[PDB]
From a paper:
To determine structural features that underlie directionality in this process, E2–Ub(T)–E3HECT was vitrified and analysed using single-particle cryo-EM to yield a reconstruction with an overall resolution of 3.1 Å. Three-dimensional variability analysis was used to isolate 7 reconstructions with overall resolutions ranging from 3.2 to 3.5 Å. These structures reveal a conformational continuum with Ub(T) transitioning from a position proximal to E2 for state 1 (3.2 Å overall resolution) to a position between the E2 and the C-lobe of E3HECT in state 7 (3.3 Å overall resolution) while the Ub(T) C terminus remains covalently linked to the E2 and E3HECT catalytic cysteine residues. The cyanomethyl group of the linker, which replaces the negatively charged oxygen of the tetrahedral transthiolation intermediate, is positioned proximal to the Arg74 side-chain guanidinium of Ub(T) in state 1. Arg74 is highly conserved in Ub, and its positive electrostatic potential or hydrogen bonding capacity may stabilize the negative electrostatic potential of the oxyanion intermediate. The predominant Ub conformation observed in reconstructions of E2–Ub(T)–E3HECT shows Ub(T) densities proximal to the crossover helix of E2. This Ub(T) conformation is evident in several reconstructions, but only state 1 shows unambiguous densities for the Ub C-terminal tail. Further, this configuration for E2–Ub(T) differs from prior structures of [name] or RING E3s with E2~Ub(T) mimics because it shows Ub(T) C-terminal amino acids within a hydrophobic groove formed by remodelling E2 amino acid residues 86–92 to create interactions between E2, Ub(T) and E3HECT that are unique to this complex. In state 1, the Ub(T) Arg74 side chain guanidinium interacts with Asp117 of E2, the carbonyl oxygen of E3HECT Ala636, and the cyanomethyl group of our linker, a surrogate for the tetrahedral intermediate oxyanion of Ub(T) Gly76.
Author numbering:
A (entry chain A): 1 to 147
B (entry chain B): 1 to 75
C (entry chain C): 292 to 668
The structure:
Amino acid sequence: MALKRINRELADLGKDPPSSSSAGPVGDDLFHWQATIMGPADSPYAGGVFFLSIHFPTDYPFKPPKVNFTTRIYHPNINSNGSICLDILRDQWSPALTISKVLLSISSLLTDPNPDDPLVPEIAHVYKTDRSRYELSAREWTRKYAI
Amino acid sequence: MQIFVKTLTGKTITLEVESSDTIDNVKSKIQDKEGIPPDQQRLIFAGKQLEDGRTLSDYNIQKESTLHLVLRLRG
Amino acid sequence: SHMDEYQRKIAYMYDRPEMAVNDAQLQLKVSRATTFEDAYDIISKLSVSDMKKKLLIRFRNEDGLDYGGVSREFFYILSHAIFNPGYSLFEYATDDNYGLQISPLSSVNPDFRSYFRFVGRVMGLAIYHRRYLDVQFVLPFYKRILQKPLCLEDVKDVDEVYYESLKWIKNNDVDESLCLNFSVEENRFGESVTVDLIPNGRNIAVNNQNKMNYLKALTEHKLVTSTEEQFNALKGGLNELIPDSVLQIFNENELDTLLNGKRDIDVQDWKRFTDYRSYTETDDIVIWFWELLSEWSPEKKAKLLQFATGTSRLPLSGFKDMHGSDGPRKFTIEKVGHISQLPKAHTCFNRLDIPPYNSKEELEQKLTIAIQETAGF
């Protein structure tokens, strides 16, 4: 169940990719994936390429995968190391969530930060008070690191 | 007119709506069909999150558009 | 009254004619450094008659009075040694929710039966002599010890997300998109291997008619079938002293209280192993916070701990060895937010955001209100 599901997900990704995000195993290890996300056009991250590391637990699909950003991103809700944990409560992950939905959700987060849950207090304060400075800094970091 | 709302579980729900309908009314229809509370609905269209208080026409939603009901990642 | 009933049960249990300690005394010497080795060398050879005599424990090269304190310290050390995940006998249910359970990998040892019989003897000796361990197992463990049936809901205590996924499968329908079949992939020393819940199980997909059997098999495999021989040895060792007819008057909570005593959260350790962001150790909203935590009942402290860290269970070594979602993450207090807003919590980072209030009373009111929706213990 934890390997047939992964093979089906990989085949589906190779069937009809979202045309922006990509994902594939590194070398030969189906439980460790590397993914690529393109910066949304209508956001300061436009043009960047962000790499993610996905570790599927052995309990997959019952337990969610560990998704961690690798490229540094100036975002109000992404810590320095990068950690995208999915939690409104322990009531949102179900075996019916593929890995494509998670990538789409990550793109949504990139294009619409949530300021009411500040994981990085300084960036959240800048976003709330002065939006232009936040945009400038975000695009500067995208230029410096993502490219 | 008609539109399509694709959820998390890969299901596709087709709805009969009008361009003047509020976002709240659409979330209400999705709650009636899927049982998802409006407070937990995160609707995305063309990379932009639909906000309460506006209309579908504000987002240029036309015949047989496709929306996404997406996870609310926290960080 | 739960306490009155529990006290009646304890008195009745210890008043039985088959649980009377002899008047003779047994001397048991162990070195503090090598506690586990000497304890296993001595206890694993005692006869049942010998283990029922009065226990007089002495630490080598440490002469002192009040042998009760010495025995309590010895049992604390031994419990924190044998039940330590690093020894590959037990293991946390999950890294971010610390619940001890028998480790399936423990079978790799040449003879795990002797070690688990020793663990059973230690638990039975602690219960027999009115001494307490300090470990916190998962409820299915106590349910197995009492020989109770295990159902799906019991997975909630072990792992929350797994239980939620199983409940989702139970409620909603299952299509062929979910490549679910009667087999489980388990990673044993790097290599992953497939275990068939039923014969030829890896080639049978779960339909809408088989999903109930699939859930039953998953629950049984996760909770029971993976650790049969080890737990059988452990329970044999335990019943060596405490007959099964005496354990079966308690339930999964009274037995936990009998083993580990009334659970409580240490505050000195909490204060010594915490870190502050934008706060100094001498700031008013920190000294007031620690005073409030000092003058609080265990239930509310556990509620606050669950609100901040995510779970009310602590590691086996206090707040020092505390793990977040991504790795070690000590309890953190940070200055974030406006005065009016309630304190907030980042669960996956063990962070608590306390705005800069102006008086202790306001801090107490806000902190008590912010944790009402959270239930601990």
